[PDB]
Amino acid sequence: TSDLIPAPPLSKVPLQQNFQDNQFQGKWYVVGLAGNAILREDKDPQKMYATIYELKEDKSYNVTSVLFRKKKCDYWIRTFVPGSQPGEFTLGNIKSYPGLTSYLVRVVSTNYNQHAMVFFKKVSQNREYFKITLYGRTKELTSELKENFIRFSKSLGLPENHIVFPVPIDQCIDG
Ligand SMILES: [Th+4]
């Protein structure tokens, strides 16, 4: 069993206007992370990881996540397929993920060369999960951007213990 804070309606999740897919490319650090299955752990805090976006000829993204785990760099590859509006995506090859029936990505805000906020919603084993990432082009962002991210996370119904700021590291994510 399992008890989750409900996903917000999509009406509460803004979309970046005039989204520019070419400018969103490249490496983003995960400076903030919040969601209904994200929990602060002071015993063993979340380490920063990175996500690299590469725009393919057909305008899908190849999306590679890089995490430092058990002394090694762990890589995860996904495809984001353009959805109903620019800045919105669904997951490619969804059938290769057991239990997954739905996956949605919406770029909420970005200035492309410093920060972004991205919303994800998925249905897995019939459970609805959502998260929000605060991306930085660098490993640090201003207090202002972080407090905005906190405000936005709370507006989607998340309490403070479901909002995490991964600790900067140098392994793997400096690629
Ligand atoms: Th995932």
Curated annotation (Swiss-Prot):
Compartments annotated for it: namely: Secreted; Cytoplasmic granule lumen; Cytoplasmic vesicle lumen
Q: In which tissues is it expressed?
A: Detected in neutrophils (at protein level). Expressed in bone marrow and in tissues that are prone to exposure to microorganism. High expression is found in bone marrow as well as in uterus, prostate, salivary gland, stomach, appendix, colon, trachea and lung. Expressed in the medullary tubules of the kidney. Not found in the small intestine or peripheral blood leukocytes.
Query: InterPro entries, from UniProt?
Result: Calycin, LCN2/LCN12, Lipocalin, Lipocalin_CS, Lipocln_cytosolic_FA-bd_dom
* Name by which UniProt lists this protein: Neutrophil gelatinase-associated lipocalin
Biological process (GO) annotations? acute-phase response; cellular response to amyloid-beta; cellular response to hydrogen peroxide; cellular response to hypoxia; cellular response to increased oxygen levels; cellular response to interleukin-1; cellular response to interleukin-6; cellular response to lipopolysaccharide
GO cellular component term, pick one = extracellular space
Chief location: secreted
Where is a carboxymycobactin annotated to bind?
A: Y49, A50, T51, K122, K131, Y135
GO molecular function terms noted in the UniProt entry:
enterobactin binding; identical protein binding; iron ion binding; iron ion sequestering activity; protease binding
- Pfam families named among the record's database cross-references: Lipocalin
- Where enterobactin is bound, by residue? Y103, K131
Result after altering K131A: Strongly reduced affinity for catecholate-type ferric siderophores
Keywords (alphabetical) are: Apoptosis, Cytoplasmic vesicle, Disulfide bond, Glycoprotein, Immunity, Innate immunity, Ion transport, Iron, Iron transport, Pyrrolidone carboxylic acid, Secreted, Signal, Transport
Cysteines paired by S-S bonds: C73-C172
Known glycosylation sites: N62
The gene name reads LCN2
Q: What induces it?
A: Expression is activated by the oncoprotein BCR-ABL; BCR-ABL misregulates expression via the JAK/STAT pathway and binding of STAT5A to the promoter. Induced by insulin.
**Superkingdom of the source species:** Eukaryota
The record's listing under Gene3D superfamilies reads: 2.40.128.20
Q: Which family does it belong to?
A: Belongs to the calycin superfamily. Lipocalin family.
Q: What does this protein do?
A: Iron-trafficking protein involved in multiple processes such as apoptosis, innate immunity and renal development. Binds iron through association with 2,3-dihydroxybenzoic acid (2,3-DHBA), a siderophore that shares structural similarities with bacterial enterobactin, and delivers or removes iron from the cell, depending on the context. Iron-bound form (holo-24p3) is internalized following binding to the SLC22A17 (24p3R) receptor, leading to release of iron and subsequent increase of intracellular iron concentration.
Subunit field text: Monomer. Homodimer; disulfide-linked. Heterodimer; disulfide-linked with MMP9.
